Design a protein around this ligand. Sequence first.
Ligand code: CDM
Ligand code: CDM
Ligand code: CDM
Ligand code: ZN
Ligand code: ZN
Ligand code: ZN
Lengths: 155, 155, 155
Amino acid sequence: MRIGHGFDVHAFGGEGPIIIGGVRIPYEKGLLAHSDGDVALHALTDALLGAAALGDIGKLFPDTDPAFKGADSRELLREAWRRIQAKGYTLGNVDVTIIAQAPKMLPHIPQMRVFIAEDLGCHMDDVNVKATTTEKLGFTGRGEGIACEAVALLI
Amino acid sequence: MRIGHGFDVHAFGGEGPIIIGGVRIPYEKGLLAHSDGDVALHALTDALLGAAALGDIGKLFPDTDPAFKGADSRELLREAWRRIQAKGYTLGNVDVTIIAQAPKMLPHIPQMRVFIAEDLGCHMDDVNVKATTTEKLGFTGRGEGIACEAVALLI
Amino acid sequence: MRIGHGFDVHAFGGEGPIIIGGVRIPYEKGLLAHSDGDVALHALTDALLGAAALGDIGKLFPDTDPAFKGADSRELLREAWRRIQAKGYTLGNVDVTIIAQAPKMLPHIPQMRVFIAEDLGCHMDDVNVKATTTEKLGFTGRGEGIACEAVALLI
Ligand SMILES: C[C@](O)(CO)[C@H](O)COP(=O)(O)OP(=O)(O)OC[C@H]1O[C@@H](n2ccc(N)nc2=O)[C@H](O)[C@@H]1O
Ligand SMILES: C[C@](O)(CO)[C@H](O)COP(=O)(O)OP(=O)(O)OC[C@H]1O[C@@H](n2ccc(N)nc2=O)[C@H](O)[C@@H]1O
Ligand SMILES: C[C@](O)(CO)[C@H](O)COP(=O)(O)OP(=O)(O)OC[C@H]1O[C@@H](n2ccc(N)nc2=O)[C@H](O)[C@@H]1O
Ligand SMILES: [Zn+2]
Ligand SMILES: [Zn+2]
Ligand SMILES: [Zn+2]
């Protein structure tokens, strides 16, 4: 069994909605990013690649490579996972922690878990997502951006 | 074995003391919160619920539900743990990282570990707590609030 | 198997280069610290000590003790590891996440992994390091300092 850790942040910018964990969440402002800026799935991906010792998302899919411009983060997630499985690993479980003052992630989590468990090919039971605010403190508390952390256990 | 991750932050406000990890730590200012604002135990709780795939603290015990107003975070911890055990899990071990510029958590950690190991019904050996400052950087470095991270391994 | 979590931050200050993960990385400004301010290895160390239930780096090697002034963080890492092994543990694997807007950690990671795997006496395969920016947000985004997180699994 191997453990992995990921972390990511994206700044708000433009018009909503935002895409977090695959779910299109309505919000006043949107997220600035090369990809779809899915903070939750980037953080999750790095955690998996991390536990597989494959580096990180920016190693496999370059921030600068133009093909990833607007790229569906679930696409990157599924590839990183394909590569991880090929290296001989199987999913233990993952846990995601979305750090955002707003929007309200709560109602979108079940669906977030459906997408992720799909992409990973596991039961939703091996996938957990939660959220927290930083009580108006920080760039997150000020609504400047969203951050997200994640851990994964591979077998 | 399952892994979990939690994270929490609370802003300073009012008169001291603060309650972290169950310990009443004396400090100039106190912590603003619905509950007792025990950042360390909230972070710990989410990590456990996270590894159990039960969501998070705000799911089980609503921030808005008035009964949790002033609620002893060890109470929430023990319940979340009861529910976790019922789902068939047993504690592997937990590790907490308190991120605060001040107060000095160090002298209070042994006692923090006694409370937590009690609430979890394990040996202190399966419970670790540590602290760190952010070197005067950030909302924590500026003494605006305390943050805390935690991980847990369930069996 | 035991899990551990570490976190650390150091403010920029003075002239470069910086030392991260053992690697001397060239940068305009340098890092302020008692030790060599190796954020990555401090974070890694706490994760290992954390999983071993030995506390944290500041417990074993006091910030105030003058001998650690300028201390090679790999030295502290190796000791904490010696002590950890003595307590009967063996390395499962570690994963580090350097949170910095700049400098570019990417090219230095292979070498970072060589040093760490050496100090831990494992194969590089049990050691992963990755990096991320906070998209110009926060003290990190503002180039005020570097932060780093890490997780470890002991056996
Ligand atoms: C999915 C993509 O957006 C591409 O489409 C990227 O792969 C990742 O984008 P991102 O989440 O915005 O992450 P970024 O903060 O821009 O950084 C990605 C890459 O830069 C490197 N990096 C980052 C920060 C830093 N101080 N030094 C670095 O070397 C890391 O190795 C990482 O692989
Ligand atoms: C223990 C309690 O205080 C109740 O007494 C709460 O359960 C938790 O309080 P807290 O530590 O201050 O955490 P909070 O930051 O206020 O958020 C709690 C809940 O809000 C949800 N949440 C939070 C932030 C966000 N952007 N979207 C969300 O949906 C999460 O699902 C979480 O369950
Ligand atoms: C390696 C050394 O620099 C010594 O040479 C230190 O061991 C660690 O230095 P550091 O990474 O800069 O970490 P610091 O943020 O200065 O804090 C170290 C110690 O202070 C304690 N601490 C920290 C913050 C806080 N609010 N309360 C505390 O009690 C912790 O128990 C930790 O062990
Ligand atoms: Zn991203
Ligand atoms: Zn809280
Ligand atoms: Zn340090």
